[PDB]
C-alpha cells in the first residue's frame, strides 16, 4: 500500500507564457494505498503548491527525510523537458515518499493528491485553522 | 461563589465552544481558530467540572 501507491503526473496544463508560468499537472493518484483515501484522485497541482508541499513534507518530518522537490526553474526555463523534469521530479519525489510510509502520511499530502485546491487551503484546514 | 465560579467556567466554555461552531458553520472555518477555541473549550468543560466537583 505504502509503496503501492500509483501516480501518474500528466496533463501538462502548462499555463501559457508569462516568463514564469506554472504548469499544472494532473496528479492522478491511483492508489491502492490505504494511506490514500481515494483509490483514484486527480488533482491539478501547480508548481508552487508542490514546492511548498515538498517543504511541508520537510516540515512535518523533523529530520525524517524529504528527498529533492518538483524541478527547479533555477536553471530550467519552462521547457517541456524542464517541466517534465519537474513532473518527473515530483514523480520521483512522490514516488519515493510514497514508498516511504511516513512522508506518504503527510495529511496535507493526502488532501493535496486527493483533492485539487492546492496545498494551501488544505494546509489551513488541517491544523483546524 | 464556588458555584459561581463553576458556572463561570461553563459560561465561558460555552462561548468558546460556540465560536468553534461558528467558524465551522461559517462553513469555511479557519482551522487555526477552530483549534485554539476548541483547546479552550475542553479546558472550560473541565473547569466547569472541577469547580463544580
Automatic annotation (TrEMBL), chain B:
Signal peptide: none
Localisation: Cytoplasm; Golgi apparatus; Membrane
Family: Belongs to the sorting nexin family.
Protein name, entry field: Putative vacuolar protein sorting-associated protein
Amino acid at each position: 500500500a505504502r509503496p503501492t501507491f500509483h501516480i501518474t503526473v500528466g496533463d501538462p496544463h502548462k499555463v501559457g507564457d508569462l516568463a514564469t508560468s506554472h504548469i499544472v499537472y494532473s496528479v492522478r493518484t491511483k492508489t491502492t494505498s490505504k494511506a490514500y483515501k481515494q483509490p483514484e484522485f486527480e488533482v491539478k497541482r501547480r508548481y508552487r503548491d508542490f514546492l511548498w508541499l515538498y517543504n511541508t513534507l520537510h516540515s512535518n518530518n523533523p529530520g525524517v527525510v524529504v528527498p529533492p522537490p518538483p524541478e527547479k526553474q533555477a536553471v530550467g526555463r519552462f521547457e517541456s523537458n524542464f517541466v517534465e523534469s519537474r513532473r518527473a521530479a515530483l514523480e520521483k519525489m512522490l514516488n519515493k515518499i510514497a514508498a516511504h510510509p511516513t512522508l506518504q502520511l503527510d495529511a496535507d499530502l493526502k488532501l493535496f493528491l486527493e483533492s485539487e485546491s492546492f496545498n494551501i487551503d488544505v494546509k489551513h484546514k488541517e491544523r483546524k485553522e | 461563589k464556588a458555584f459561581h465560579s463553576w458556572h463561570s467556567a461553563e459560561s465561558e466554555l460555552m462561548k468558546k465552544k460556540a465560536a468553534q461552531d461558528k467558524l465551522l458553520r461559517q462553513g469555511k472555518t479557519q482551522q487555526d481558530r477552530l483549534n485554539q477555541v476548541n483547546a479552550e473549550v475542553i479546558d472550560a468543560e473541565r473547569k466547569v467540572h472541577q469547580a463544580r466537583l
